[PDB]
């Protein structure tokens with residue numbers, strides 16, 4: 001019965017005073033310096049930056065007061081370049097809780113030929129930094145969770161090595177979804193997997209460009225997409241967003257009709273509800289050397305941080 005609870009789960013709406021406190025409690029400059037900039041490095045699988053990005057993500061989470069439990073899902077797989085090692089990073093509050101809201105991005109960067117190096121600013125260093133800043137900004141509230149909690153997933157190997165294909169893409173997410181699908185949850189249960197425990201997978205990807213438009217991809221998360229719309233509307237109305245227009249909304253309610261392959265596919269195809277926070281169109285700088293810090297829109301990322309943090313608190317009734 002409990003795997004159906006996600007279908008009836010309600011948010012706890014925060015009032016205006018709470019929303020101001022949340023908007024006050026996140027610091028885009030702190031995130032820029034302390035979470036984003038160390039990740040703006042070459043970090044394709046097995047590179048020195050891959051280990052350094054992984055170590056940076058784990059250290060930023062480990063310094064928080066909330067009782068995050070870190071797991072590294074490391075595995076080998078053949079690739080166009082030969083066998084490679086991949087390591088997904090899983091950061092979980094309340095591991096034995098039956099249900100988790102899951103936030104996720106990919107922390108690898110795409111490999112490009114060797115003056116300029118590809119650091120994937122939007123793709124997806126900024127999503128990584130947004131998740132760490134959410135963990136930091138909500139630490140005291142999350143501390144109060146010490147059958148629903150929060151989990152972060154940083155996928156390795158999202159990018160193709162050579163040619164985007166089912167076999168040359170989503171190495172980490174395809175591995176982790178298979179692993180979770182095969183793993184009892186709660187331990188000792190019959191039937192139910194760790195995937196039954198995923199209330200909702202919120203996948204952040206290609207965030208950081210100015211004027212993003214996120215469409216409503218999936219009917220079975222459309223009501224959660226509408227909460228993002230309503231949070232954006234209310235924060236705007238309260239004057240808590242920067243350089244933001246109602247005529248330039250981030251979250252529009254129409255769909256895409258196509259299929260945007262991404263780390264969520266291995267979870268979606270196994271029944272996990274997905275809120276895919278990827279823009280359409282992709283950023284103009286997408287998969288070019290211009291996907292760098294200079295072309296990021298700080299105020300837009302700040303606004304999305306505020307929207308996402310309100311969303312997560314409301315989801316968790318915190």
Ligand SMILES: COc1ccccc1[C@@H]1C[C@@H]1NC(=O)c1ccc2nc[nH]c2c1
Nearest residue numbers: 123159160162163164205206261262287
């Ligand atoms: C330079 O781009 C290419 C040229 C030739 C062959 C393959 C590619 C690259 C794989 C990408 N395709 C994508 O659909 C894609 C989908 C979701 C993503 N989330 C972050 N990044 C993404 C990229």
Ligand SMILES: [Zn+2]
Nearest residue numbers: 110123159287
């Ligand atoms: Zn990419």
